[PDB]
Amino acid sequence: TIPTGFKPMLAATLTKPELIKFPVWASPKIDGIRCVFFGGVAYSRSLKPIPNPVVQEFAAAYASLLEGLDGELTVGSPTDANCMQNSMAVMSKDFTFHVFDWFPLRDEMGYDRRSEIVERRIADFYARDIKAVPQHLCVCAEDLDTLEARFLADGYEGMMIRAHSGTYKCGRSTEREGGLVKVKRFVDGEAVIVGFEEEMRNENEATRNATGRTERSTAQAGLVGKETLGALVVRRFEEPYGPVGPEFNIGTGFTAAQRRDYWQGRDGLIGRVVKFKHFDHGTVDAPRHPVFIGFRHPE
DNA sequence: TTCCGATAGTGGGGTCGCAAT
DNA sequence: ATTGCGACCCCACTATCGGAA
């Protein structure tokens, strides 16, 4: 059950696409749940054992075969990640583990050589389950394109990029390294302010997690409100334009200065329009990952 | 000089587990 | 049996520091 001194490998957002320094392997980003097997016990993105019992009894069967196989769990792929998560519960089954990397220990292995062991043939013996995330070889900018579209058209959220001989990084990869890059696209939109919430400072005791990430609790007993803006309660704004759809909050994309000033004059913000961006192409109700850009009409 | 790699501290959505009523 | 909160999943972003470019 022993890791070593390891923290899972995390992709980097795709920016500066000219330094994407080529031959690489492109794979589709599945919205499952990150999972890593170590010594017969399945771990999560934060190294916290998977709660579901069937997947854990599944582990150590075999520890030697399911050792260090870094992957992501799901159930009923392209539809939704919501159901891909009755694996955090302590019952109710068919998780189809997908594997897309393996961890040796700690120069070191490259992905060419690492994505060589992952082709573990569990099938001939047992054949319960397990799939290998398909990797596509790409040589030029045109190949990432012409493929991200196929992934998107098939229903995946995004595309992942891996350097052919990148080393396993126990941390978050960077663009100059090129170890792991994710390609997920934002889409702009408009909204009208309808309410406010103030920012909340968390004063609970600070704790280290397994990966050394400083973590505090959300007990709400130590949440003491600052005098800044925390989030904007808004609705979609779209010859009447007017507002449509349910109410959703936008709590990210503000500078420290904007949060202070906007809260001081929040009364004047009701009824003024803002641009925001989000994911899941379309004006779908209940947007996801909303980010505030600016006001439709500055000053 | 400027960049950036890493951390900390805010925020969004969602499903489960569990104590409390 | 229901409620209600908090942990935990998937994230995004800004601010900051000190070493790297």
Numbering used by the authors: 2 to 94, 99 to 111, 117 to 138, 143 to 252, 258 to 318
Q: What text comes from the article?
A:
However, a small sub-set of DNA ligases lack additional globular domains, instead using extended loops or positively-charged binding motifs to engage their DNA substrates, or relying on recruitment by additional binding partners.
To gain insight into the structure and function of ligases from this group, we recombinantly expressed and characterized the minimal-type ATP-dependent DNA ligase from B. pseudomallei (hereafter Bsp-lig). Bsp-lig is extremely effective in nick-sealing assays with higher specific activity than the canonical bacterial Lig E Ame-lig, and similar activity to T4 DNA ligase in the lower enzyme concentration range. The new 2.45 Å resolution crystal structure of Bsp-lig in complex with DNA to shows the classical conformation where the ligase encircles the double-stranded substrate. The concave face of the OB-domain positioned in the minor groove and the ligated strand positioned over the active site of the NT domain. The latch region of Bsp-lig is positioned in the major groove across the ligation site and its complementary nucleotides, making kissing contacts with the NT domain. Multiple alignment of Bsp-lig homologs shows the most highly conserved positions are the pair of asparagines (Bsp-lig Asn216 and Asn219) in the N-terminal beta strand, a glycine residue at the beta hairpin in the tip of the latch (Bsp-lig Gly 226) and the T(E/K)RS motif at the end of the third β-strand (Bsp-lig Thr228-S231).
